[PDB]
């Protein structure tokens, strides 16, 4: 089902609140890695 997805991916926003200007995004690394995969 999707009820199982909803359980496993549930996010208590109060429990895990938001709180750095020198931290490369995770997406930047994705894009570089997919580029190098194209050769291998």
């Amino acid at each position: 089902s999707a009820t199982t997805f909803r359980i496993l991916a549930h996010l208590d926003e109060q429990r895990y609140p938001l709180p750095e200007k020198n931290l490369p995004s995770l997406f930047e690394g994705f894009k570089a890695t997919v580029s190098i995969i194209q050769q291998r």
Partner: protein, 98 residues
Amino acid sequence: DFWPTLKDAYEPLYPQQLEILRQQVVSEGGPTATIQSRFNYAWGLIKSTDVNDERLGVKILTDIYKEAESRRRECLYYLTIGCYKLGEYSMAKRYVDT
């Protein structure tokens, strides 16, 4: 703040490329692998056309969000795109609000 667009999230990778990202994850310890490698796999999964891959990709991103306080902001954005793709608009609304 180099973030993904809707456009990127809707183009899948080849099965063997996704498998490489998967293999890298397993290599480093699965759920205990590095944040970068888990993300790379989660995004590839979100890009997949298979709703269940997309759900797993979103689950892994949630795990990143939980574990890494320094990644929460950007992950909320990634989470919004992935939930959108899945038709999970109530989640996507709530996240992009925060």
